[PDB]
Ligand binder design. Sequence first.
Ligand code: HEM
Length: 153
Amino acid sequence: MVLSEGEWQLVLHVWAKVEADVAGHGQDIIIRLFKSHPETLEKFDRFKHLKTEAEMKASEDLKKGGVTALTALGAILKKKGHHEAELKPLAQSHATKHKIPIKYLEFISEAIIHVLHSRHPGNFGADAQGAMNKALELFRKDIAAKYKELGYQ
Ligand code: HEM
């Protein structure tokens, strides 16, 4: 699969709004992930004790981790598919150190789409959401191929 430039521009135009406040978007996305799929919280040894959304919102560590994760995703998206170099360390850590199944990358993709749909109707109409889904699908397809090369799943 290959995105068109027009599709990449829809992706980047909503990402530009994420970047007004990546920390707040990261909190919403990670909290949505943990609420929709609580099993995913068990993968975060630093956070797995948190019991409520209030505790999650107050966690400086969770906020910082959301900034780190979304910034890495943003760098991937800005490569517009030419992301081999960026996927290498991310695939290795997520396959081998953190043990994140592809299914959980699907869950976080769903959380990203949900939060962008809620926060950014001006830049996340149907065409823009379709483009973001395509970009995240490409990300997951390429990282899954790397997982397999690395010996995981
Ligand atoms: C868009 C998808 C994702 C991106 C771009 C991303 C990015 C990152 C980055 C950059 C780091 C720090 C460097 C590293 O260890 O690789 C990290 C750490 C981590 N990620 Fe992800 N991640 C994603 C999805 C997930 C998911 C779905 C989970 C679990 C369900 C997860 C679990 C973790 C954990 C446990 C750490 C270590 C956190 C810590 O040290 O406290 N990641 N991630």
